[PDB]
Paper text:
Viral replication requires a 3C-like cysteine protease (3CLpro) which processes the 200 kDa viral polyprotein into six functional proteins. The 3C-like protease (3CLpro) was named because of its similarity to the picornavirus 3C protease. It is a cysteine protease which shows a typical chymotrypsin-like fold containing two domains: a β-barrel domain and a β-sheet domain separated by a groove where the active site is located. The active site is characterised by a catalytic dyad (Cys139-His30) or triad (Cys139-His30-Glu54) and shows a strong preference for a –D/E-F/Y-X-L-Q-G-P- (X can be H, Q, or E) sequence corresponding to the subsites S5-S4-S3-S2-S1-S1′-S2′. The key role of norovirus 3CLpro in the processing of the polyprotein and the absence of homologues in the human host make it an excellent target for antiviral drug discovery.
Fragment J12 is the worst in terms of resolution, diffracting to approximately 2.1 Å, although the electron density is still of good quality. Screening with the DSPL library and part of the Maybridge Ro3 library identified 19 ligands in total which bind in five different sites, as illustrated in Fig. 2.
Author numbering:
A (entry chain B): 3 to 173
B (entry chain A): 1 to 173
């Protein structure tokens, strides 16, 4: 049983299974030409979109092996989350991120709305596995609270250089 | 982390070890099978074993891994270095866990006395457990970092605290 099995390749990025019927992803990674996802006709899928956050609700159990997890609209300011990055090499890269305010941020000359964060893996990556790349979009932000895992949004954007990431949130 | 570093990470006893070169293999002392008299088809007589607490180095008299180039092994790393711990998990999943390294330390963990280079995981806030932190089966995994153009190995995974936020790298002496 693992959080990592819920992280799924999707479109030009990734998404996350909250429950057997609920999948979350970043809006800009979703295909714009499709009649089905995960073998289910698009006719039978409810799509709920809020800026860079999208939630799919399926009419049957796609992932019956999973329990349902707590999904919230962001997290309290100062919470340290993990972004659960999968790479096509087969690497799993959990990175600590300190979450800040909900904001409109200028990220490579474009406006992105969501919960700001700062990577805690330090000055740079180099060739080291310490930062995000554009193909990581849709990876989930998670943290542990009491005995429960909480999912609070999806990876939407990052500055090419610095420290700053945007986590798109529900509602 | 480069494929050539993952290729050197080898399942061994109750954990792992790592090929520095075609003749040199390093691991954590407590993962070695205690009754073993043969390694990679070679008897004990043809191997030079150098043990310093939880760090063990095996030097073979023939080339076991001729596919490999020899790389740099150092005695830990500067304080503040960020390393990756190259951990293999159930099913060809590769977990290069980020760790900020600190001072050489003597600690008591689950009653055992442990000595090596301390570090703190950079994977999340509460790293107890297998999704963001280490498990006992990870002992012997290598600590590596990139220094300008090349990669360095600076120890092997020896222990983690009950909270899982602190780890100890056993180092060559
Ligand atoms: C940069 C910074 C400032 C402050 C106040 N807290 C933290 N938290 C932290 C850092 C690494 C791992 C886990 C938590 N980080």
């Amino acid at each position: 049983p693992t959080l990592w099995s819920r992280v799924t390749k999707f479109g030009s990025g990734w998404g996350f299974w909250v429950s057997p019927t609920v999948f979350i992803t970043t809006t800009h990674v979703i295909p714009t030409s499709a009649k089905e996802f995960f073998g289910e006709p698009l006719t039978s899928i409810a799509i709920h979109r809020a800026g860079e956050f999208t939630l799919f609700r399926f009419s049957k159990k796609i992932r019956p092996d999973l329990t349902g997890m707590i999904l919230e609209e962001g997290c309290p300011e100062g919470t340290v989350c993990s972004v659960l990055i999968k790479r096509d090499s087969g690497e799993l890269l959990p990175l600590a991120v300190r979450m800040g305010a909900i904001a409109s941020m200028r990220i490579q000359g474009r406006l992105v709305h969501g919960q700001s964060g700062m990577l805690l893996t330090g000055a740079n990556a180099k060739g080291m596995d310490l930062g995000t790349i554009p193909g990581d979009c849709g990876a989930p932000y998670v943290y542990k609270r009491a005995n429960d895992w909480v999912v609070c949004g999806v990876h939407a954007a990052a500055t090419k250089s610095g420290n700053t990431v945007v986590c798109a949130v529900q509602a």
